[PDB]
């Protein structure tokens, strides 16, 4: 059965937070608001009156999944033999092992919470208590990004896209991290106009922030300055030296990043959307997160001033 019994919930809270956990609450609702992913979320009222979310993991989930990962690795071994993409295996081992210890995502969320405290554009729920199998955070509600994808005014969609773009370009500058690969479930629209970010399970660390070579590359690509574009690309890791590349192939490569900054306000959309081999990680991560944000923006059909935000936040993009 999907919902875990109250006794087991109390057992988890006892094992993780102690037998006196109830003293930290003004109230605690023993029936789960959500209950799917090897565990469930409860709503409660903390001692100071703040509404709180309490994520609690199923007791047997840990070892079960730990065995299952080894299992899937082999089975695909057999598959590798049978028909020569296992990156999927790496990828979901990586995403799954995050859930074995909530403290990881909790720490990422802490980082973003301090970095974006009292920010006029972003809202991050504060981590109140953290344990391997239990994590308590501030309850935060607003219009989910999925809802805004399906319905809602163009103004709202443009706002969400703008917020996500600002998050993508601005995160590595504020703290040496990126929010990572996201889906619209991670975001919501608060009444005051801020974007709420409530999932940090795929946060990517990025020491030093964006390499200036990115902004340089996109800028020079827009300016058609090939003679200075190519060396900056070879320096960025975009290209290898001694590589026969056609100029189109370059354009083909960079249009995904250059087209939105050709104009003052670019209209992200699905239709436009339709159209790493020894890379350095400090280049590979930005491209992937940016791709994520672009996909979401196209889902939002958002009109985003990417040129201004880049110019302000992306190193090396501003005119020299």
Residue numbers in the entry: 98 to 181, 185 to 375, 393 to 437
What does the paper say about this structure?
Here, we show that MSMEG_1954, which has 79% sequence identity with MABP-1, is responsible for macrolide antibiotic resistance in M. smegmatis. Similar to MABP-1, MSMEG_1954-form 1 and MSMEG_1954-form 2 are both composed of two domains, the kinase-like domain with a phosphate-binding loop (P-loop), and the N terminal accessory domain that consists of six α-helices: α1–α4 helices (residues 1–114) and α6–α7 helices (residues 158–199). As demonstrated in MABP-1, MSMEG_1954 also has ATPase activity with a kcat of 0.00864 s–1 and Km of 0.231 mM, values that are comparable to that for MABP-1 (kcat = 0.0137 s–1, Km = 0.285 mM). The structural studies verified that MSMEG_1954 can assume two different conformations, the closed state (MSMEG_1954-form 1) and the open state (MSMEG_1954_form 2 and MSMEG_1954-ADP).
No electron density for the N-terminal 97 residues (α1-α3 helices) in MSMEG_1954-form 2 was detected. The SDS-PAGE results of form 2 crystals showed four bands, suggesting that the missing N-terminal 97 residues in MSMEG_1954-form 2 were probably degraded during crystallization. However, the N terminal accessory domain in MSMEG_1954-form 1 and MSMEG_1954-form 2 have different conformations. In contrast, the remaining α6 and α7 helices of the N terminal accessory domain in MSMEG_1954-form 2 are positioned far away from the kinase-like domain, in a way similar to MABP-1, which leave the substrate binding pocket open. Structural superimposition shows that the MSMEG_1954-form 2 and MSMEG_1954-ADP complex have similar conformation to that observed for MABP-1 and MABP-1-erythromicin complex structure. For MSMEG_1954-form 2, the degradation of N terminal 97 residues may decrease the steric hindrance, which release the compact arrangement of N terminal accessory domain. It is likely to represent a transitional state between MSMEG_1954-form 1 and MSMEG_1954-ADP complex structure.
